[PDB]
Design a protein around this nucleic acid. Structure first.
Ligand SMILES: [Mg+2]
Ligand SMILES: [Mg+2]
Ligand SMILES: [Mg+2]
Ligand SMILES: [Mg+2]
Ligand SMILES: [Mg+2]
Ligand SMILES: [Mg+2]
Ligand SMILES: [Mg+2]
Ligand SMILES: [Mg+2]
Ligand SMILES: [Mg+2]
Ligand SMILES: [Mg+2]
Ligand SMILES: [Mg+2]
Ligand SMILES: [Mg+2]
Ligand SMILES: [Mg+2]
Ligand SMILES: [Mg+2]
Ligand SMILES: [Mg+2]
Ligand SMILES: [Mg+2]
Ligand SMILES: [Mg+2]
Ligand SMILES: [Mg+2]
Ligand SMILES: [Mg+2]
Ligand SMILES: [Mg+2]
Ligand SMILES: [Mg+2]
Ligand SMILES: [Mg+2]
Ligand SMILES: [Mg+2]
Ligand SMILES: [Mg+2]
Ligand SMILES: [Zn+2]
Lengths: 50, 203, 86, 122, 53, 118, 53
RNA sequence: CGCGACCUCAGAUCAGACGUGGCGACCCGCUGAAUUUAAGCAUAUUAGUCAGCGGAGGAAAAGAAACUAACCAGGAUUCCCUCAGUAACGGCGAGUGAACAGGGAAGAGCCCAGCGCCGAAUCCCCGCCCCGCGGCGGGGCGCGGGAAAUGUGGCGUACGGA
RNA sequence: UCAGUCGGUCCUGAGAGAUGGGCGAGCGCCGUUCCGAAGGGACGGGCGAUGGCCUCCGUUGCCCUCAGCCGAUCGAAAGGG
């Protein structure tokens, strides 16, 4: 929909910024067990709700 | 003392003198709304013996309660169960209409606290009560030691817990062989105390 | 045409995100929330779903002010006093 | 160098304001440098400037509120923010004076019949 | 004039007092002292007024 | 005096204004949306640089709570440059991108290279 | 405080003596002890007790 | 016609306050079933239980007899043992089912209305001065305002009081 | 992903929904003009105050006088606009 409301567009904005991958320097930490970002979202598998 | 004559007169309700006053008051109160504030109590002596004092911080609310029993709020029939609980028309509420009157008066005036309530009139379909309310945050009440007990948070909403004179009657408590089913905190407390297994460590 | 073909007409949502509970249950036509009842001043809460109650309790979220009140209690809610300077 | 709050409190309001704006200008140009892409010195200095701005604002607010409550120290009605923010139940609780008020009945009762100090031989 | 309900009530109450058979114990107050005796009584009462604060 | 209309309405009474014995808040809240926090950082994209070198405008990244008038005044106070018009959009990332068209006298290239972006 | 001599009411226990609730007013007035000072000096007082013996 | 009171009811972005909602293990008030058992089932049982609604506190409620007893009498409320799976209720079927006394934990008593007696001897608010103020109080000055005689305060409450 | 001119934003349709009121043990429910003191407006006139070359006017504060409305409010990115 091209007629997005302000709140929905802001919600989509946060989801898009959350969808980025983990930086490669984090997994060099000592107490680290994050091998990858498991909560990635794809527009063809998960429809994000709404 | 005037109050002695007043209460003796009020005990003679069936006489013509009081009957004219009762019907005039009942009609006048019926013309008004269900919940309103009376600037002064209708019965001074009755208010005084219920605890009212003519000082700032005490107010009187004259409230009207629809007379009658209580039918089960279900659809037309539809008591889906055993024939014991088919009763819908001839059920009675477990609290007095006075208790209902003071609880909704207290609910409307959430800032004030119910002290007592009494009966000022009745009709075929309506009964009128006057409820005494105390402003706990008025300094004329808070600074007086003999009546500052109501200001404590323990007495929050006495009418909805059943702590007023009308509320206590519905609980069925008091000393005697006639109130064995309520010894303890209340009727439910007594039942809970009886219906437990006191399993000791050594049995 | 009861099944797969019928599913092709899903193009106008019924609920939207509630502005109080944050879940996507605010009914548009009813103008009420099926998760917390936003227009009603009292939070929707039933004892027949313990899991639903536990999912959103006092200790679930941030406790932005309550956890501050907890650490103020252990000192008795001091006010106007500061430790002596060096 | 490293700005600290010890020597900021003695500074007057206008001087603090004319230092705060310079801190804002430096933060803004450091942000511009970050966006363009520069050395790590500016990137590290961004946090320092932000904390310095925060510390200056904290000092200004503390002095302002201290002066306000000094002004309202002796008055009867004071603004809500200046009023003591304890728990709601504690605020609604009766004060020590009111709870210590005792009616003349119990006053004279304690006068006539005080609690005595006694002991009993074995 | 469509008077307010309170004005209507306080007027028809007086109408009801004039309509219903008022008992003598209540109607005795309607029979009152005359004007000249009333003002003479007030003149006498004005002598023994209580002290103000 | 007599009543002409057969209906009765509430007479208009005298109502006074607020004269509190104490202000509700001790001090007015400080303006957190000042001329420095309204604008965050100018864009350095190739598209932005192509726009500043052709249309004599500038590109800024601002918060979503800034009006076009506020942006114009903030740019004027911060950089002493007249503003012709402002066009604002909200990027899909959430930040508001503002195009600030300057007055014909000023040159966007000079303003850009003297504020840092180049 | 000190509690008085008391024997149990029922027939099953009328041969035994237990501890009482408090000293009766009649007992106190015979002993010449005021009802308000007895509690202060540590004497249990309850006004409901009678004395049929 | 108007002026001035009293009484009932309005309008206030009037000055000063309060309630709203949440947690809800425990507690108080109300409403409140069917599963199940009875080898079926309708009274009963499940059960004043689940579900539902309202209201708090650090505990709540109760509470100082319109009591228990019938003895040579005890003496607020509450909780443990015991009374007791008893008296008793029950298609007297399944089943349900207290209380008194006794031993302990704890133990604390009191206050009004009314009748009366004291010049309303009472109380609230605003102005000013002093003191400490992050539980807005104490003293003093206001022919300052108000509540109240349709009853405030002192004495005084079933154990008598004046 | 850049708008006074494209739409929303404005209006109201079927409807939905507070106040008054009534009911309800109760969360609340019914009801939308019905058991309402439902106007915060104004041509003009008078009193009093301020500013500007106190001329004349503007903002006011108070009084006189005049005044219907249909019900607060929501409801369409294809209706009006
Ligand atoms: Mg049955
Ligand atoms: Mg009865
Ligand atoms: Mg739909
Ligand atoms: Mg609830
Ligand atoms: Mg007294
Ligand atoms: Mg106000
Ligand atoms: Mg609550
Ligand atoms: Mg069976
Ligand atoms: Mg079977
Ligand atoms: Mg069967
Ligand atoms: Mg039964
Ligand atoms: Mg039963
Ligand atoms: Mg029951
Ligand atoms: Mg329950
Ligand atoms: Mg209690
Ligand atoms: Mg007694
Ligand atoms: Mg007992
Ligand atoms: Mg039973
Ligand atoms: Mg016993
Ligand atoms: Mg008296
Ligand atoms: Mg154009
Ligand atoms: Mg409705
Ligand atoms: Mg609209
Ligand atoms: Mg349109
Ligand atoms: Zn919700």
């Amino acid at each position: 929909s091209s007629h997005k409301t302000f709140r929905i567009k802001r919600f989509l904005a946060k989801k898009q910024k959350q969808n980025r991958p983990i930086p490669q320097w984090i997994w060099m930490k000592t107490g680290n067990k994050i091998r990858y970002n498991s909560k990635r979202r794809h527009w063809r598998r998960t429809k994000l709700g709404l | 003392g005037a109050y002695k004559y007043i209460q003796e007169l009020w005990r003679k309700k069936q006489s013509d003198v009081m009957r004219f006053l009762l019907r005039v008051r009942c009609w006048q109160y019926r013309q008004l709304s269900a919940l309103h504030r009376a600037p002064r109590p209708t019965r001074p002596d009755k208010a005084r013996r219920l605890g009212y004092k003519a000082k700032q911080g005490y107010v009187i609310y004259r409230i009207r309660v629809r007379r009658g029993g209580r039918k089960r709020p279900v659809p037309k029939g539809a008591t889906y169960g055993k024939p014991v609980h088919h009763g819908v028309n001839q059920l009675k509420f477990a609290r007095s209409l006075q208790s209902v009157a003071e609880e909704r008066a207290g609910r409307h005036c959430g800032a004030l606290r119910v002290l007592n309530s009494y009966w000022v009139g009745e009709d075929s379909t309506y009964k009128f009560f006057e409820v005494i309310l105390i402003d706990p945050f008025h300094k004329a009440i808070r600074r007086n030691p003999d009546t500052q007990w109501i200001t404590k948070p323990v007495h929050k909403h006495r009418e909805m817990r059943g702590l007023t004179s009308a509320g206590r009657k519905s609980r069925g408590l008091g000393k005697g062989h006639k109130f064995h089913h309520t010894i303890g905190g209340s009727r439910r407390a007594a039942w809970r105390r009886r219906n437990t297994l006191q399993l000791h460590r050594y049995r | 045409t009861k099944g797969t073909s019928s599913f092709g007409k899903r193009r106008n949502k019924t609920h939207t995100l509630c502005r109080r509970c944050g879940s996507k249950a605010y009914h548009l036509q009813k103008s009420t929330c099926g998760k917390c009842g936003y227009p009603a001043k009292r939070k929707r809460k039933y004892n027949w779903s313990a899991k639903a109650k536990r999912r959103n309790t006092t200790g679930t979220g941030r406790m932005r002010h309550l956890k501050i009140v907890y650490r103020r209690f252990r000192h008795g809610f001091r006010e106007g006093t500061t430790p002596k300077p060096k | 160098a490293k700005i600290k709050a010890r020597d900021l409190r003695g500074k007057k309001k206008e001087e603090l304001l004319k230092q705060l704006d310079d801190l804002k200008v430096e933060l803004s140009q450091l942000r511009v440098a970050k966006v363009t892409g520069g050395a790590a010195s500016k990137l590290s200095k961004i946090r320092v400037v932000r904390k310095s701005i925060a510390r200056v604002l904290t000092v200004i607010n503390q002095t302002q509120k201290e002066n306000l409550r000094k002004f309202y120290k002796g008055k009867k009605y004071k603004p809500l923010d200046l009023r003591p923010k304890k728990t709601r139940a504690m605020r609604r609780r009766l004060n020590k004076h009111e709870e210590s008020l005792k009616t003349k009945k119990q006053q004279r009762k304690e006068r006539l019949y005080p609690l005595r100090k006694y002991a009993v031989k074995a | 004039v469509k008077w307010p309900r309170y004005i209507r009530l306080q007027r028809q109450r007086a109408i009801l007092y004039k309509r219903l058979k008022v008992p003598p114990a209540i109607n005795q107050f309607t029979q009152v002292l005359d004007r000249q005796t009333a003002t003479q009584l007030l003149k006498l009462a004005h002598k023994y007024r209580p002290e103000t604060k | 005096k007599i009543r002409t209309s057969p209906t009765f309405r509430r007479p208009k009474t005298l109502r006074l204004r607020r004269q509190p014995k104490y202000p509700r808040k001790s001090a007015p809240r400080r303006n957190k949306l000042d001329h420095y926090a309204i604008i965050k950082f100018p864009l350095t994209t190739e598209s932005a640089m192509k726009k500043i070198e052709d249309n004599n405008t500038l590109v800024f990244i601002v918060d979503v709570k800034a009006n076009k008038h506020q942006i114009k005044q903030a740019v004027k106070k911060l950089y002493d440059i007249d503003v012709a018009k402002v066009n604002t959009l909200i990027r899909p990332d959430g930040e508001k991108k503002a195009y600030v068209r300057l007055a014909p006298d000023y040159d966007a290239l000079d303003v850009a290279n003297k504020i840092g972006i180049i | 405080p000190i509690r008085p001599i008391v024997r149990c009411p029922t027939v099953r226990y009328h041969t035994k003596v237990r501890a009482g609730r408090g000293f009766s007013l009649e007992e106190l007035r015979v002993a010449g002890i005021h009802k308000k000072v007895a509690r202060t000096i540590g004497i249990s007082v309850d006004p409901r007790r009678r004395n049929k013996s």
